[PDB]
Design a protein around this ligand. Structure first.
Ligand SMILES: [Mg+2]
Ligand SMILES: [Mg+2]
Ligand SMILES: [Mg+2]
Ligand SMILES: [Mg+2]
Ligand SMILES: [Mg+2]
Ligand SMILES: [Mg+2]
Ligand SMILES: [Mg+2]
Ligand SMILES: [Mg+2]
Ligand SMILES: [Mg+2]
Ligand SMILES: [Mg+2]
Ligand SMILES: [Mg+2]
Ligand SMILES: [Mg+2]
Ligand SMILES: [Mg+2]
Ligand SMILES: [Mg+2]
Ligand SMILES: [Mg+2]
Ligand SMILES: [Mg+2]
Ligand SMILES: [Zn+2]
Lengths: 60, 115, 177, 84
RNA sequence: UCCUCCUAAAGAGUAACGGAGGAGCACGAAGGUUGGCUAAUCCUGGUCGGACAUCAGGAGGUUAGUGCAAUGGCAUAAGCC
RNA sequence: AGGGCUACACACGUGCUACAAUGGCGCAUACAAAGAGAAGCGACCUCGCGAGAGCAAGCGGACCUCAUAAAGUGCGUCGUAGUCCGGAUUGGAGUCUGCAACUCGACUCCAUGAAGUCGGAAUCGCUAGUAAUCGUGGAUCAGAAUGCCACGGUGAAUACGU
């Protein structure tokens, strides 16, 4: 890589709420506090009409 | 500061800041903050990470943001596919709750279109 | 190189089984990832293009290459040779690190993320996807953001077909809907 | 809308017509003037011709319609646009 | 007055108030050299983004390009950096 | 019997609500007048976030009920933002009256959160308990007022002059 023209690219720690920790090189500089990650997002995990309601509200 | 996929305002009181979420009004903001054990006047930036996570958990019990938007679009399209009077009003961009249209009805009709 | 070591240790074997390749060289590879910002707003303001380049540098970790108009186009009011975007080509270690960060951090931060389209293959096993907002990358600070900008991401692979490309990406548990 | 405790309103002549037609099979459209009657699940598949003021409008009842009134599907005013 | 093509009869040249177009410059790099490079157009996929911007791949194979007419050239490029 | 008088490219009149900080929101807490009520007004209690519901006194009334007056005052917050301004529109769920709320009711709850940052030319009302502002009641009426009729609270500016 060319010298002296690229962003600073050094390892950090990404800590998610679900307790997942990933050690990733990054340009962000500081450590991370993720609100979601691949291991807990509902779509990743797998966690994601009229007659019925008519009968439920109008029970005879 | 990141709850329900959007950024909450950090300098506002929490009760105000949570209403940034599509689907949380004032009543739901107060209920979420009571069920997360956080006072209403506490600013978001004076909250811990455990506190913000409890807030996220509390918001999780509600249908908000994209899911709520999908629900609303589904209901409107159901009306519009039914061919019922309400659906036809939605189709024509006219008031749907029996309001007058001889005058007014400008929120639905938009700005006047001259002849 | 977590995802590259995963590719070599697991994905190669999985694909060999799934497609019955006669040689390990036949397994599809991830060759390059290109990030593109089409910055048309630069026709009048050059700070817009410079800020796009800064965003791309923060995201990818590489100083971007400013791209220029190939021919003059009245319809967009652009003359030939005018700088109207920026790209980065990510290869090797940087490419695998960005692939990991994308998959595990940035995609989970997409507003209302319901899964990536699996039809977005160009016909030869290369996958392109759009980003609408650069804040999904943690490298971009939210309260420093001047303008809302997205980008294009292309994953070029050595797959002879779209099915092999999709299988290669799915092996990494790519968030296909 | 109508109070839940009162149940859903329907005109008796219409309910009887719907029961007869369901029993006998799938008859020709039943002509009714009862725009105020709720659409019940047992009307699904029937065709009810509902008065809109001057003509009966054939309404092919589906499952989405249950709980709506018959008059919601028989518009009463003819509008096609001004200056056309 | 000058340039290009045809008339012009497969060397050169060849007339008409014959048929068609151009010039009266530009450039200290658009000159020299060394190293490198390869077009048009279409299809598919891709944030804004659309018929047309930028990105990736494919098809194509010079149908591009040449500071400015036309003809003859040009890949070993005379074309692009 | 059902539909219409409730239509909707548009023009005008009369209003209501606003555009905020002399304000919004939360908590607490003062001070009215006038009126209506028997197929009516309906307390207390219990249930419900609420509209309401169930039970059930009292009252043909200076007695009972409608029926916390609000502005105000104190405390706290918001800090000039299309906002903790505004509350139109729309989705969902309800209540009540009424044979019956689709066309086409009022009200409640959750969500939504438009225009609007004081209004071109023009133009209206008002000389004092008036204007302005704040609540309250009544007729019509099963239900259905921002209209109408009526009632108090706070309470100005200015009139040289012709
Ligand atoms: Mg609300
Ligand atoms: Mg109405
Ligand atoms: Mg010759
Ligand atoms: Mg010859
Ligand atoms: Mg001769
Ligand atoms: Mg060369
Ligand atoms: Mg040269
Ligand atoms: Mg009649
Ligand atoms: Mg009328
Ligand atoms: Mg009365
Ligand atoms: Mg408000
Ligand atoms: Mg505005
Ligand atoms: Mg303002
Ligand atoms: Mg006088
Ligand atoms: Mg008043
Ligand atoms: Mg009444
Ligand atoms: Zn996680």
């Amino acid at each position: 890589m060319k010298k002296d023209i690229h962003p600073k690219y050094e390892e950090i720690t990404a800590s998610c709420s679900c307790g997942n920790v990933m050690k990733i090189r990054s340009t962000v500089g500081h450590d991370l506090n993720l609100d979601v990650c691949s291991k807990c997002h509902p779509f990743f995990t797998g966690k994601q009409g009229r007659v019925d309601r008519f009968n439920k509200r109008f029970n005879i | 500061a990141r709850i329900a996929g959007i950024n909450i305002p950090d300098h506002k009181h929490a009760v105000i800041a949570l209403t940034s979420i599509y689907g949380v009004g004032k009543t739901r903001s107060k209920a979420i903050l009571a069920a997360a054990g956080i006072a209403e006047d506490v600013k978001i930036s004076e909250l811990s990470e455990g506190q913000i996570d409890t807030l996220r958990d509390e918001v999780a019990k509600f249908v908000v943001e994209g899911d709520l938007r999908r629900e609303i679009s589904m209901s409107i399209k159901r009306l519009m596919d039914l061919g019922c009077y309400r659906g036809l009003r939605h189709r024509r961009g006219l008031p749907v709750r029996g309001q007058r249209t001889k005058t007014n009805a400008r929120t639905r009709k938009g700005p006047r279109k001259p002849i | 190189a977590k995802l590259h070591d995963y590719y070599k240790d697991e994905v190669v074997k999985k694909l060999m089984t799934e497609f019955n390749y006669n040689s390990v060289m036949q397994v599809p590879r991830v060759e390059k990832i290109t990030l593109n910002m089409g910055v048309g707003e630069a026709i009048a303001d050059k700070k817009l293009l410079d800020n796009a380049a800064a965003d791309l540098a923060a995201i990818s970790g590489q100083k971007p290459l400013i791209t220029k108009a190939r021919k003059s186009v009245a319809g967009f009011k652009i003359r030939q040779g005018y700088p109207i975007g920026c790209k980065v080509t990510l290869r090797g270690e940087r490419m695998w690190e960005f692939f990991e960060r994308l998959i595990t951090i940035a995609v989970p931060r997409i507003r209302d993320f319901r899964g990536l389209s699996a039809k977005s293959f160009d016909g030869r096993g290369n996958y392109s996807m759009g980003v609408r907002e650069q804040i999904i990358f943690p490298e971009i600070d939210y309260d420093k953001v001047d303008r809302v900008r997205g980008l294009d991401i292309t994953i070029t692979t050595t797959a002879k077909s779209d099915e092999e490309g999709r299988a290669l990406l799915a092996a990494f548990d790519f968030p296909f809907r | 809308p109508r109070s839940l405790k009162k149940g859903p309103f329907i005109d008796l002549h219409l309910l009887k017509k719907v029961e007869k037609a369901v029993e006998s099979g799938d008859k020709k459209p039943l002509r009714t003037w009862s725009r105020r009657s709720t659409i019940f699940p047992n009307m699904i598949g029937l065709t009810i011709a509902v008065h809109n003021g001057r003509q009966h409008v054939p309404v092919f009842v589906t499952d989405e319609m249950v709980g709506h009134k018959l008059g919601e599907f028989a518009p009463t005013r003819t509008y096609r646009g001004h200056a056309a």
